[PDB]
RNA sequence: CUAGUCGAUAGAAUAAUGUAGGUAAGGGAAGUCGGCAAAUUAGAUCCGUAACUUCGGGAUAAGGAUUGGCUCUGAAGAUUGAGAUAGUCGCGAUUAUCAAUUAACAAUCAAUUCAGAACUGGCACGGACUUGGGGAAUCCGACU
RNA sequence: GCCCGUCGCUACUACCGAUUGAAUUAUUUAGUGAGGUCUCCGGACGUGAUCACUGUGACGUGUUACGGUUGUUUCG
RNA sequence: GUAUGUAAGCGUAUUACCGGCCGGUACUAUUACUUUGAACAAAUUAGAGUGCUUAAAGCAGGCUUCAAAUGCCUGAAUAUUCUGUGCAUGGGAUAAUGAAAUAAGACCUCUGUUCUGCU
RNA sequence: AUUCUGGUUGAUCCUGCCAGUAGUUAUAUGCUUGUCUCAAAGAUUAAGCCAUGCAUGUCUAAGUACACACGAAUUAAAAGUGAAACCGCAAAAGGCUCAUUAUAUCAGUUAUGGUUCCUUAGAUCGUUACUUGGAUAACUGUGGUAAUUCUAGAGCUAAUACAUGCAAUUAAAACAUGAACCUUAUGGGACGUGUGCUUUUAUUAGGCUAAAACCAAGCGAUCGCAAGAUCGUUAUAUUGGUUGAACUCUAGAUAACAUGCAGAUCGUAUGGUCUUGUACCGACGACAGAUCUUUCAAAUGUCUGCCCUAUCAACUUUUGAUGGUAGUAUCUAGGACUACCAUGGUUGCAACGGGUAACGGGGAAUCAGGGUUCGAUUCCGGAGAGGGAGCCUGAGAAACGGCUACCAC
């Protein structure tokens, strides 16, 4: 573990996904080492300072999360630069808010607001059903739930909503072509539905074939697809215009026949 | 600080490797046990993160298993008398992995009569006439289920006639299967069926 | 070659001769326990009804194969159950527009199922963990094994 | 040890100078025509070896390490092979093929060399004996 | 007209060269060996119990409850 | 009128099956090269967006709000130095290798006239 | 902005250079200067030497208060303040430098089913003083010393520190063994116990086409009075992963082994319960501990890429070179090391030795392309704290704003 284990974090270290500025702080927030990955993790510090703007500076939102304003899941999550992960129902009950960490459609982070019974669930996928831990089964998800007792049926790779009130699984969906899907991290992060076909390459990195809502098609491995529901079918109210991938010319009209003129 | 690490050893086309990094701690050989035969001395070290490990040197006692049924008795370790690796670790007697061992043959024995109501091996008759108390626990056949069950078993007494001479002399064979410096035990397998007929090659017909 | 032949005794770890008590009598026809490597590669014959101990075997040894699977021809066959192939690539530079013939030679442990490799067979390697110092591979099949015209047509 | 001698004029005493042999603090050639004389080294195993050369040598160049005792281990061979298997006679007595065997196969027997390893003592170990100091040059004769 | 070496003088740069020359740097054979890690023993002072010290509380005075510049054999 | 650059039929493994010409399956001589992908930090560079008074920079910023601001968002793209190897996929020109000559031409096979069996 | 000009000659056309020209976050230096916006800045020479100054400490309602410093005192509340002093944590990140170092470091690519890991997270405790032991610092007091660097003796005193262990710590139950039983059989034990955790070894099934003929129990049932032979279906020849397979994971079983663990903690805020019995109970913890998982990592490993040099062509086993078996050690693979045994490995496709004014990369400079040149330097990886070596605490250091030698100063 030598020479470490390496406690700070630069800027132009940080990943870009975060839309941070360069210039201004010479640090970034050094995601404490939560429940979700390093760079997999919008942490709460990036969350409140710089795309909700309720907190100007890094003395600001320490003077919130530690009077216990903010919740993710229930818990209340004081730590300042918490992780705060992807599919997470981030609850700030006062005043009322609900907000969700989705990817963009060009694969960042975005702000997204939500329904107070949507904020009862999320999805999760699942990576390992393990068995021999709590009882004898055994599943553990994504974002790091130990979710003892799922289904039999459930295998690798599904995802299951879990309401998060409580810690039990009440709708799986299996990963099959015929199902809405997104992706978590690739060149195509952002991208949503619906799956066509997974290229089975034993050992390893069998890759997946994905075409999307406008017929086109793109492909990326198995850890980065992430099932959301059925064919058009989601489960989660999708951010704007649904990760459809616009061109490169179809940024310029919008930015134009979608502007003030 | 005897060092693993591999920035010795001129590389596989024989050139040398310079410098490297003075040492590090993490590549710590920490030295021997050289677990002898004796009064059971442990000592305890610490090692990579938190954890301990506990050297043998000096070791008594194991508790060995006999390997066509599975059965673990506590016995005394007599002395060694084979080791593939040195033969001054047969001298100076230091038990290491598989190294053989003569041990006892007695807690197998009683042990046994349970199931093996003839018992094995076949104790002397002229001193030994005295009865504290064999045949009350050979079968006592109890009127009912288990001594019943005792035709039901002693269909396995067909033990081999290898290890029947060395239950009769009381000195049985045995092959260390645990790492002593690294466990501080030393918890073997009798050996019975391949390598009784094997080592003894390396002990009887080497003389 | 080898009938068990070291001053230790050569055995598979994890297998007896368990008589008496057992759930039924399993015998699977020896007491030998064989795997399969199964990235498709046949498991072979001599594998599961062999005699040979080999405990770096991938298939009947403490190994797993892993990583990355590679091929090349062989060198010679000299050391005991290893052997040396030989890559052949070519590295390209941008100056020249041209390629250049290169070649590494890995060492790679080789099971004694393939006795009779001989240089030059076509063979086909898998990474395993490091084995000695060398050697961090495992042969996987003698795939052409066929030397193509100065080789092999016997005399 | 076998054989052979104690025959060298004998006793007392141990001054000087001697002939012959030892040792000597510290220094180490200052001594001297000149290291004369003396001193050092030396057997054996392993390492290792320079200038120059007629390529053969130089070379034991130089420069190092090891060695006793005791108790062990390993290597080097020889003659017999071992001889399964079926039955007879009455375990005795009596009658033979070969796949393999098979390295100190199983016996039996013999040799003294070589490699290790523990333990051990003014750490004195070639313990007497036997037994090269070494190197850089010049001049002469080639060499025996 | 051009042009070439020797020799002579002046100045400069490199060369070979007795001295087995000097200065240094890096590795390293052999020797002695600091300090440490490990480990066979060592076991200071101080310990729980104990033969036991005896007061009172107790018991039939002793011992303990309780304390001791208690000592001792005990034993860890 | 023609043109031809079009897909299919037809000198046939334009491939065994079930589905409504159509999904899902059963099912495949390589290599080099090439097509399209994945994979991989920013900063830099290439660069679209943005009147920092302009500019180098920066990643901010717009806005009937003219008299109330609630005033939504543009954003923070996109490809190249992260070359190269390596990994997927389309192609078969070029280019090497590969078969059937001291023996394999086959049989889709009821199949064994081997026997290894295996639940 | 894909460019050339003078220069050998009496004159000419050439090859050829030398000189011109230009850019350089590219370095010094000359002269020069009104504003301003950003701003590199002891790298090169000497990883040379350094005065002082500072650069690493830390508290909540909530682990410990007996501070007259006191807030307070008929709230002896003491929660204020708590200075101290334990404890707890961090001090292994930052920050610098570029001496080493040539397949080394590094880059991309892949592994760890060959490995450990503090913390944050999600499962995460019905297995006879009970809410115990003494002893300690701050504090008093007495001292030593050229030495503000340190520290002895004595008098006290606490714990989420130390050390021990029960009132549910509780077994029932589950369940085997022997066992109240008795009985012919996918039949039945009353009870003693054993039942945890982690350790270690061994044995066991370990990821699974279909019918009978036939037979041992003779099971439902059939022939039969039955025994007992025939056959015969359902539940029953029922453990997971990657699902690329002996992953030996904790799982599952069995025989056992040695050492500990198994909340004697804490307050905001108190209540239901008053039988006021202080019996019956709140949210809690920055709390604590065992196991699996997660995270931040780490160390190894893989294939490919790394400058000059043949006035370096052969190298590699003094005392490991390459491989085998077994072992030891390590967190772990491994000649990492020991033991025996094999004679292998490597190279003209540049091994090996040598050089380097060599940290590697991102990248920088410069032209139309092709390129040369540079990268000490802000980001990533690596090394080092005058030299070499050594090692404690720890989860993590072969640490140097830790110690231990020695050398130099």
């Not at chain 1, 709708?171 to 089975?200: A, H, P, Q």
């Not at chain 1, 492909?219 to 064919?231: D, S």
């Given at each position: ?85 992807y ?14 960490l989705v990817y963009d459609?060009?694969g960042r982070f975005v ?71 997104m992706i978590t991290?690739?060149?195509?992060l952002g ?48 951010p704007?215009?649904?990760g ?18 | ?207 | ?155």
């Amino acid at each position: 573990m030598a020479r470490g284990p390496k406690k700070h974090l630069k800027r132009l270290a940080a990943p870009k996904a975060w839309m941070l500025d360069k210039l201004g702080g010479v640090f970034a927030p050094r995601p404490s080492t939560g429940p979700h990955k390093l760079r997999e993790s919008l942490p709460l510090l990036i969350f409140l300072r710089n795309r909700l703007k309720y907190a100007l500076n890094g003395a600001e939102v320490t003077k919130i999360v530690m009077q216990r304003l903010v919740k993710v899941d229930g818990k209340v999550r004081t730590d300042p630069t918490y992780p705060a992960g992807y599919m997470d129902v981030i609850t700030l009950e006062k005043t009322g808010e609900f907000f969700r960490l989705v990817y963009d459609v060009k694969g960042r982070f975005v702000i997204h607001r939500i329904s107070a019974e949507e904020a009862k669930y999320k999805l999760c996928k699942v990576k390992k059903t393990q068995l021999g831990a709590k009882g004898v089964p055994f599943l553990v998800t994504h974002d790091g739930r130990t979710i003892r007792y799922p289904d039999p049926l459930i295998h690798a790779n599904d995802s299951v909503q879990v309401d998060i009130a409580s810690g039990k699984i009440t709708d799986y969906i299996k990963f099959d072509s015929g199902n809405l899907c997104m992706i978590t991290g690739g060149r195509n992060l952002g991208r949503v539905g619906t799956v066509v076909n997974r290229e089975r390459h034993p050992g390893s990195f069998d890759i997946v074939h994905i075409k999307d809502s406008q017929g086109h098609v793109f492909a990326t491995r198995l850890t980065n697809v992430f099932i959301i529901g059925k064919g058009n079918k989601p489960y989660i109210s999708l951010p704007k215009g649904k990760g459809v991938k616009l061109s490169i010319a179809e940024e310029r009209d919008k930015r134009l026949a979608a502007k003030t003129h | 600080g005897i060092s693993r690490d591999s920035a010795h050893k001129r590389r596989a086309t024989g050139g040398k490797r310079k410098s490297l990094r003075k040492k590090r701690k993490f590549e710590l050989g920490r030295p021997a046990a050289n677990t002898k035969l004796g009064s059971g001395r442990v000592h305890k070290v610490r090692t990579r993160g938190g954890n301990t490990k506990l050297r043998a040197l000096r070791l008594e006692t194991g508790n060995f298993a006999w390997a066509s049924e599975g059965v673990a008795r506590k016995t005394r370790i007599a002395d060694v008398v084979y080791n593939a690796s040195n033969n001054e670790l047969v001298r100076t007697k230091t038990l290491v992995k598989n190294s053989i061992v003569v041990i006892d043959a007695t807690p197998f024995r009683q042990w046994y009569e349970a199931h093996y109501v003839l018992p094995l091996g076949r104790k002397r008759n002229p001193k030994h006439a005295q009865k504290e108390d064999e045949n009350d626990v050979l079968t006592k056949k109890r009127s009912e289920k288990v001594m019943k069950k005792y035709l039901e078993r002693q269909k396995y007494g067909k033990v081999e006639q290898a290890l029947e001479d060395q239950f009769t002399s009381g000195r049985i064979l045995a092959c260390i299967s645990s790492r002593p410096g690294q466990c501080g035990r030393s918890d073997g397998y009798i050996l019975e069926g391949k390598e009784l007929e094997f080592y003894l090659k390396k002990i009887k017909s080497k003389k | 070659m080898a009938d068990q032949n070291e001053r230790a005794f050569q055995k598979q770890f994890g297998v007896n001769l368990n008589r008496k008590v057992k759930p039924g009598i399993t015998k699977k026809k020896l007491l030998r326990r064989s795997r399969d490597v199964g990235l498709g590669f046949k498991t072979p014959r001599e594998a599961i009804d062999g005699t040979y101990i080999d405990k770096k075997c991938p298939w009947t040894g403490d190994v797993r194969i892993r990583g990355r699977i590679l091929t090349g021809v062989v060198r010679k066959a000299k050391m005991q159950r290893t052997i040396v192939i030989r890559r052949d690539y070519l590295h390209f530079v941008r100056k020249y527009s041209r390629f250049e013939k290169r070649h590494r030679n890995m060492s790679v442990h080789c099971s004694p199922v393939f006795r009779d490799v001989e240089h030059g067979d076509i063979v086909t390697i898998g990474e395993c963990r490091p084995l000695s110092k060398t050697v961090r591979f495992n042969v996987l099949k003698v795939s052409k094994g066929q030397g193509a015209k100065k080789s092999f047509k016997k005399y």
